[PDB]
């Protein structure tokens, strides 16, 4: 029913589908990204998502408490999820800051990125139409690189702190703090408009994308695969990470406990509908992105894979071109950027609310004692602001890319999902989990979910991990910039901040149990009442 969609899909459908998926697909060569994407989807995404929903509904609480009633030994999964959300909230709002900056720069009679007569623009610029009348540069890309971003030559040169981006971040975080502290949510009649406007904007942008000349090459690049490319563990990691990130895998359990607590509802069918909708909107926005990419390739006379940045700025490079090739470009640009802000703000609100609830669940005696509820939210928003302030500098793009790749992505999500599935399937028991689901919703999961939890997800996780550490390649920004060893170490430290949460809590709880070691393992493995 549409009620479930308007109630739930707002927190899942966000920037990950319209922005993260297109650039991951473009980075991996287009069509080769889709096969592992769908394999990971139908192997783990929906099953693990339903597992998170069941875990949340079983205890009526987030990851801070539900794991104590399943397996006390592996209680570190909740802390890992909490730190994953903490790292995600720092860098997810940088996209909203960029969108706000673009929206503010859109209040002009002519879009700044439509032409390159301005002062920030390099002499190498040449108009796209006149480029195919050398090493010329399109105004749309170099605008994004120099005005909005002011890209430093490397991460070793942080440069100055951009004040305009800092104030945009301040505005977005003030909105977030006000909404969280005032309990503002999309419960009013405006929820219909808030949900329906992004899809209408995406449909308009897609319609614009198809009618551009040369879009057929873009669709061909999007859909035609390259087997040899799949042999690159990078594409497998990207597909699995995108599947886990778009569906909030290892993050859903803290919010589904309250959101998905409605009784008499079909949890299985609701999860299936959400999975269909999210994958559909992602795959649909892929066509819109790749049609614009193909049109740019045909206009500039260059290969499709070389037209734009193979990084987070693919959306901010492609979509402004589309709104510039529409009648009254300012109006369409403004609409698109309010749409992007609305998609990001709801997901950010859901994530911040989940983080706050989990953290106050780690300390109810102090934070819930009174007026501390607002002070904790203010402190969280201030600390996240100070952490994100590193990413608005001239070299902030490299830090943003590192955080995107490692902090809430990569091997950490595979690690957490593999441990969750392994625990639930083998240590807690698949036969007991099926009985619990039978008691909760009335019917057992069946064979697909059971086998996916038992074998399919762990096998995929360990296979991707082994293929990554056997064919490892360094992380790179764009197609040429190689990261320094210290940046790679920082990214690995960000990943390990969540990766080590399981073994450390395991050893801490093992040292907290009296008696022999075997007695300690027996006590910690047995679920609590």
């Amino acid at each position, epitope marked *: 029913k549409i009620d479930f969609v308007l109630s739930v899909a707002g927190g899942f459908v966000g920037l990950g589908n319209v922005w993260r998926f297109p650039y991951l697909c473009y980075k991996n060569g287009g069509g080769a990204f889709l096969i592992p994407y769908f394999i990971f989807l139908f192997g783990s995404g929906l099953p693990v998502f339903f597992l998170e929903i069941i875990i949340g509904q079983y205890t009526s609480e987030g990851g801070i408490t539900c794991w104590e009633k399943i397996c006390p030994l592996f209680s570190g999964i909740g802390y890992a999820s909490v730190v994953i959300v903490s790292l995600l909230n720092v860098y997810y709002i940088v996209i909203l800051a960029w969108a706000t900056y673009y929206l503010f720069q859109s209040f002009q009679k002519e879009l700044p990125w439509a032409h390159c007569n301005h002062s920030w623009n390099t002499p190498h610029c040449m108009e796209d139409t006149m480029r195919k009348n050398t090493n010329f540069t399109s105004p749309v890309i170099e605008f994004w690189e120099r005005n909005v971003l002011s890209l430093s030559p490397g991460i070793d040169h942080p440069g100055s702190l951009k004040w305009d981006l800092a104030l945009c971040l301040l505005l977005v975080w003030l909105v977030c703090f006000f909404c969280i502290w005032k309990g503002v949510r999309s419960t009013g009649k405006v929820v219909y408009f808030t949900a329906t406007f992004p899809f209408a904007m995406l449909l308009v942008l897609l319609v614009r994308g198809l009618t551009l000349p040369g879009a057929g090459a873009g669709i061909k690049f999007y859909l035609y695969p390259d087997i040899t490319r799949l042999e690159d563990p990078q594409v497998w990691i990207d597909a699995g990470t995108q599947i886990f990130f778009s569906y909030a895998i290892c993050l859903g359990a803290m919010t589904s406990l309250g959101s998905y607590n409605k009784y008499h509802n079909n949890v299985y069918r609701d999860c299936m509908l959400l999975g269909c909708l999210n994958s559909g909107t992602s795959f649909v926005s892929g066509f819109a992105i790749f049609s614009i990419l193909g049109f740019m390739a045909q206009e500039q006379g260059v290969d499709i894979a070389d037209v734009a940045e193979s990084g987070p700025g693919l959306a901010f490079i492609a979509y402004p071109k589309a709104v510039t090739m529409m009648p009254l470009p300012t109006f369409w640009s403004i609409l698109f950027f309010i749409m992007l802000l609305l998609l990001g703000l709801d997901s950010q609100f859901v994530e911040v609310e989940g983080q706050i609830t989990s953290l106050v669940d780690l300390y109810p005696s102090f934070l819930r004692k009174g007026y501390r509820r607002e002070i904790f939210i203010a402190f969280v928003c201030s600390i996240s602001y100070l952490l994100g302030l590193t990413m608005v500098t001239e070299g902030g793009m490299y830090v943003f890319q590192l955080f995107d790749y490692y902090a809430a992505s990569g091997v950490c999500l595979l690690w957490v999902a593999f441990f969750e599935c392994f625990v639930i399937a083998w240590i807690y028991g698949g036969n007991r989990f099926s009985e619990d689901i*039978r008691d909760m919703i009335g019917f057992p999961p069946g064979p697909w979910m059971k086998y996916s939890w038992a074998v399919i997800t762990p096998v995929l996780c360990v296979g991707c991990f082994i293929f990554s550490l056997v064919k490892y390649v360094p992380l790179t920004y764009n197609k040429t910039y190689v990261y320094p060893n210290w940046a790679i170490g920082l990214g690995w430290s960000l990943a390990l901040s969540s990766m080590l949460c399981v073994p450390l809590v395991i050893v801490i709880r093992l040292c907290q149990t009296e008696g022999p070691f075997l007695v300690r393992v027996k006590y910690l493995l047995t679920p609590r009442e």
Partner: antibody
Amino acid sequence: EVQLVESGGGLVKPGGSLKLSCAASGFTFSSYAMSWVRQSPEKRLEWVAEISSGGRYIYYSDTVTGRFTISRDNARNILHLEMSSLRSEDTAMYYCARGEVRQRGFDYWGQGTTLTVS
Amino acid sequence: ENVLTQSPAIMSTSPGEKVTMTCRASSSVGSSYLHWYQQKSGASPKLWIYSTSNLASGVPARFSGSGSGTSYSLTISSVEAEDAATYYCQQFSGYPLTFGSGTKLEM
């Protein structure tokens, strides 16, 4: 999913104790929930108790919650129903039914056994 | 306990005609949490209709079911001699489980 057979019915005095049996074959008894359905001599159906596939979750009717107890034997695929105190209204014919799916109901029913109190 | 009651306890019928019998519940039950069972005279009951629409494997399309909220019913396109039996409505929405008073075709 072929056979269900009950056993253990007999004649007892009021207030006594008796244990019923329900044998199963042709399907995985350890993965299917089992419930007992009671048919009064007036032909009225009444639910008694339900036991989960693993036996951890167990429910009883309000009329027999304090006197009845249900157990299962996954190794022998035998379902047991033990009662401590049979009242005058406890005389009926007992059926064991497979109730693994709540949205589907009792798929299979056994032959049943009569219990008489006097 | 949600007491379920069926009004037409006795239904005299003519062979080949259509017969519809209804079940009522004291509280609203889900559409997927009510089922019907057929019990032959002197035989054990058997599942007949589940989820209020899905016919069982052992029953042809001749039988049908419909209903929602607190009211539910089943329909027979044309009753034959083999259709003479007792039918019970049962709920699975919440414990304790309850069965209807039953409706027996008298012809």
